Design a protein around this ligand. Structure first.
Ligand SMILES: *C(=O)/C=C/c1ccc(O)cc1
Length: 124
């Protein structure tokens, strides 16, 4: 699926995509609701983290799946963007819970559908 991490219109392209199409992205893609529950989780993300995409759907990202992200630097910025209504922000991070420690770049961006927010991930 031809779309680059950090693209200016990434939210438009992914709004058109089904599960198999999301699985064809070169980067990890997670869709969360405003509470952090997992709506979508693609195959590239599971390749990074060792999570089975079907198993994590419905779980809470910040409480259950990814406690290392429950911090001002990650969850705090997610919450701020959900509240302000315009989430679009990038940072580096280390993922290390139930996986080998892995440096990543994260891009958070509001989705087009209601109460929906993307978390995109690639290795660094
Ligand atoms: C830290 O606990 C991060 C964990 C994690 C990040 C991203 C995922 O897709 C799964 C687990």
């Amino acid at each position: 699926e031809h779309v680059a991490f950090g693209s200016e219109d990434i939210e438009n392209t992914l709004a058109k995509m089904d599960d198999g199409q999301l699985d064809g992205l070169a980067f990890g893609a997670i869709q969360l609701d405003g509470d952090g529950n997992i709506l979508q989780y693609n195959a590239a993300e599971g390749d990074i983290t060792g999570r089975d995409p079907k198993q994590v759907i419905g779980k809470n990202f910040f409480k259950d799946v990814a406690p290392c992200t429950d911090s001002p630097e990650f969850y705090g910025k997610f919450k701020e963007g959900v509240a302000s209504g315009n989430l679009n922000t990038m940072f580096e991070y280390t993922f290390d819970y139930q996986m080998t420690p892995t440096k990543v770049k994260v891009h958070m961006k509001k989705a087009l559908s209601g109460d929906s927010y993307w978390v995109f991930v690639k290795r660094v």
